[PDB]
Amino acid sequence: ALAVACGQGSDLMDRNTENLARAAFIEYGGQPRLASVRLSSRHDALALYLTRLVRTLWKAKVVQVDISSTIPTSKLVTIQENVERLRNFLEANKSTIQGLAPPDIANQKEHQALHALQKLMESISEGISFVLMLFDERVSDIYARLDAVSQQQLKDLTYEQLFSQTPGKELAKVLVKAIVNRNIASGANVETVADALRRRCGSFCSPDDVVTFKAQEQLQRASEQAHNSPVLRALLAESLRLFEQVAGSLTPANLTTAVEQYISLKYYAGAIQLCLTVAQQKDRGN
Amino acid sequence: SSLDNIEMAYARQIYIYNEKIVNGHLQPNLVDLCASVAELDDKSISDMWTMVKQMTDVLLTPATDALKNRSSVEVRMEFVRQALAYLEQSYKNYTLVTVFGNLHQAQLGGVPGTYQLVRSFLNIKLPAPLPGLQDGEVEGHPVWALIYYCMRCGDLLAASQVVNRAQHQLGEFKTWFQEYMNSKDRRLSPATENKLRLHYRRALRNNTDPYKRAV
Predict the structure, then answer these.
(1) Is A35 on the interface with B (CB under 8 A)?
(2) What does the DSSP assignment read for A248-265?
């Protein structure tokens, strides 16, 4: 019923059938009970459907090392669409489906269980979007300019780990921090790759990182335009504005790369002012 | 001495220009004699003389009255072209320093073709796609943005290349544009000029693609 309600079988009246399927999912889904709890058949059905949508992904490695993707991109798209249509179905019926809205111990764990599944769904969609973003770039190029531990972590990274384990999230945060670096070398567009990472895979990307990426953009593009005289004083001055904003949140690894570049461009006095500013914003109370 | 560094350098240049006329020599280019000092100052002044030279570098009628040259429609027309050529080239330098941090930086790697420069200019000034654009894209950018900033830089050829790769999408605009690039003085024939204006005025007076409106 859940599947039909989400449009499955419709690749073959159809609104009424899907509305009937919705009615069957609500009316006959059961309820949670004390036996440790026994969750409703409605919950197990949602878990069963979701699992079967990602069964080809879960235990599979993300990549195959000339690195490529284990799962074809076209398959990742359809899986994501199916997960999203399931999410859309739960949102449009948050008020009528038991357990979605907040509610005694039985209905409590029913709400917690259903909530956890929905958080996994959005994490699945974010994870898939991240993999698609990754292979839109030149991963082999990114994979080359990488440390061994992170190459090994990426070698045996599964979709399960990407979706549900901190190391996948931490590694994802490293890869995004690396792809933008490379994107700046190609230099097609920084602010487009920004809004790409900002929204779709939000909750995994950080807005303090994109402003940093915007700063490293002008820095590298100030090294690109380095031969020009009057164009840099606008690039380096605007890079400095971007750095000082995220001063209370710059990593020592980035702050160094910034100062290293400033010295190449004889921007001595400016680089000193950034480090002084980063200091005060890490310890405002002095 | 009551003369500042800049003023003094100009005086020396005006002494040369006088020494030349006092000894009967060739009348050298005064505008060049003044820009020689400008480079010793910030580019605020250099870019001025660049405009002065290009605005005065018009074919004149030697030994003709001043008022006559400036009233003649002949000369008044070339002024507009010399200015447009300055605004286009001036903007083209803005597009370079926007992509590369320094003019020198752009030069070492080589000034890219006006088409690839403009494309590498759209990447920055519009990173995300505006939802009001029309007529699709061309190699990853809206077709009308490319046409505008190419015309803005003054490379009509680069703009026409963009049109050639979107023949199906742009409709009848191809035969109209190809005439604009051919006809001199940046003007179309009254008949064809009438055909496009009425079409734009008909249902495109307010279109969601500003670049389309501009072109």
Answers:
(1) no
(2) GG--HHHHHHHHHHHHHT
Instruction: Enter the resolution in angstroms.
Output: 23.0
For chain A, what is the radius of gyration of the CA atoms? 24
SS3 A2: helix
Q: Is B182 exposed, middle or buried (0-12, 13-18, 19+ CB in 10 A)?
A: exposed
A154 touches chain B (CB under 8 A): no
Give strand ranges (E) for A153-225.
none
Distinct helix (H) and strand (E) counts, chain B: 13, 2
**Following CA atoms B55, B59, B61, B65 in sequence, which dihedral angle do they give, to the nearest 10 degrees?**
-10
- The shortest C-alpha distance from B176 to chain A (Å) reads 32
Is A243 buried (19+), middle (13-18) or exposed (0-12) by CB count in 10 A?
A: buried
Distance from the Cα of A190 to chain B's closest Cα (Å) equals 7
Way it was determined: cryo-EM
Pairs of CB atoms within 8 A across A/B: 89
Q: Token digits for A245? A: 């904003």
d(CA A100, CA A94): 5
DSSP A137-155: S-HHHHHHTS-HHHHHHHH
Contacts of A111 (CB under 8 A, 6+ apart): A99, A100, A102, A103
Helix (H, G, I), strand (E, B) or coil at B127: coil
- Selecting from A195, A196, A226 the residue whose C-beta is nearest the C-beta of B105 gives A226
CA-CA distance, A255 to A270, in Å (whole number)?
13
B153: amino acid identity, one letter:
C
Substitution target in B44, B102, B107, B108 with the highest count of A β-carbons within 10 Å is B102
Inter-axis angle of helices A41-54 and A73-91, nearest 10:
160
- Torsion on CA atoms A13, A16, A21, A27, rounded to nearest 10: -150
CA distances from B175 to A56, B165, B215 (A): 53, 14, 15
Cβ burial of A26 (10 Å; 0-12, 13-18, 19+) is middle
Distance from CA of A276 to the nearest CA of B (A): 25
Any B CB within 8 A of A10 CB: no
In 3D space, the residue among A232, A219, A217 whose CA is nearest the CA of residue A259 turns out to be A219
Tokens (6 digits) for A209: 């990182």
